[PDB]
Design a protein around this ligand. Structure first.
Ligand SMILES: Nc1ncnc2c1ncn2[C@H]1C[C@H](O)[C@@H](COP(=O)(O)OP(=O)(O)OP(=O)(O)O)O1
Ligand SMILES: [Ca+2]
Ligand SMILES: [Ca+2]
Length: 319
DNA sequence: GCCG
DNA sequence: CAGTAC
DNA sequence: CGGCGGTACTG
């Protein structure tokens, strides 16, 4: 729909970003839920009382909204730390978070060139710094498709029955993507095994995979790769790529989880908890007693159904 | 930051 | 264990 | 006042 409260959310996003890079994770989360609540509200917010009735907006958030309504400006925006642009600069390095960004700032570093010459870097952060510009830009939707087809083609060379899906914002119909996550499975329930490691080998040989961030991550029977790819041809940029191989049993939940968004996932976890359940990339389960009971879910719709929730197409999962 |  | 990412 | 998910890898 249309955001009737753009004059409000524009300013709040600045604060959310400031709180974010300063390590204040929960405070940032509150702003994010608030901003989401505002831009999905059916009309302009016009009073403190009306603001408070909205779930996700309490007194402190309502005070700010009202200030914006009354004067058109937020005072807090004029008192945000001078360090925020620099901490944001450092936080856009893959492998570096707020703790690192603060350490670097406290060491006197103020630019990427300083990090490069005076700072110690993990192998991951060195790759993040090397591809900094390319990772900051979002790719055209059409490029996410080619990357998907590249992984798909290499995978079906081992087993034609394999199924590959690109999740994330791409699956949600965004015109651009921050990165690509390709989910791979097989319907026979077994042929997905033994594919992952020699798939990555193949993709390295043809020069598609350029760097590894996490070469291998084993979570249950899921296998995950985090790395960097680059399509053939002149002018092509380095892009963030994820490859997850999952068994068919967990495909619906994995699909649901990697499609996102992260806000949406969080909301579904909360909803699951109210019905005495848990939701992960692997399954929908009854709450812990020993472990819990895995409720089987062949399709994403079965997940919504077991949660007593009307299905939402991927395009409608922004939060 | 907000909620239960 | 702490930090980071998913 | 505590939860806002739980898990894996890197160092
Ligand atoms: N704290 C979390 N932060 C980010 N992603 C998470 C988190 N928890 C679960 N996920 C999931 C949801 C995401 O859809 C999935 C990977 O998607 P991701 O690349 O991070 O963003 P996105 O593809 O939805 O948007 P975009 O491409 O614009 O960055 O990881
Ligand atoms: Ca409220
Ligand atoms: Ca993505």
């Amino acid at each position: 729909a249309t955001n009737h409260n753009l004059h409000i959310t524009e300013k709040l996003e600045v604060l959310a970003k400031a709180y974010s890079v300063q390590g204040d994770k929960w405070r940032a989360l509150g702003y994010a839920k608030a901003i989401n609540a505002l831009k999905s509200f059916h009309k302009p917010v016009t009073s403190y009382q009306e603001a408070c009735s909205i779930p996700g907006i309490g007194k402190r958030m309502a005070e700010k909204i009202i200030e914006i309504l009354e004067s058109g400006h937020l005072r807090k925006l004029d008192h945000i730390s001078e360090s925020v642009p620099v901490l944001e600069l450092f936080s856009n390095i893959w492998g570096a978070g707020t703790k690192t960004a603060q350490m670097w700032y406290q060491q006197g570093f103020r630019s990427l060139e300083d990090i490069r010459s005076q700072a110690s870097l993990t192998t991951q952060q060195a790759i993040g710094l090397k591809h900094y510009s390319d990772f900051l830009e979002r790719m055209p939707r059409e490029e996410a498709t080619e990357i998907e087809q590249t992984v798909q083609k290499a995978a079906q060379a081992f087993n034609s029955g394999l199924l590959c899906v690109a999740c994330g914002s791409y699956r949600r119909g965004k015109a651009t993507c921050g990165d690509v996550d390709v989910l791979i499975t097989h319907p026979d329930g077994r042929s997905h095994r033994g594919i992952f490691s020699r798939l990555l080998d193949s993709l390295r040989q043809e020069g598609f995979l350029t760097d590894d961030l996490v070469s291998q991550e084993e979570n249950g029977q899921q296998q995950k790769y985090l790395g960097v790819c680059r399509l053939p041809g002149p002018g092509r940029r380095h892009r963030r790529l994820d490859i997850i191989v999952v068994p068919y049993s967990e495909f619906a939940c994995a699909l649901l989880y990697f499609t996102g968004s992260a806000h949406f996932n969080r909301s579904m976890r909360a909803l699951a908890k109210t019905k005495g359940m848990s939701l992960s990339e692997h399954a929908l389960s009854t709450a812990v007693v020993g472990p819990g009971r895995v409720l089987p879910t062949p399709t994403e719709k079965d997940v919504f159904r077991l949660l007593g929730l009307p299905y939402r197409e991927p395009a409608e999962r922004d939060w």
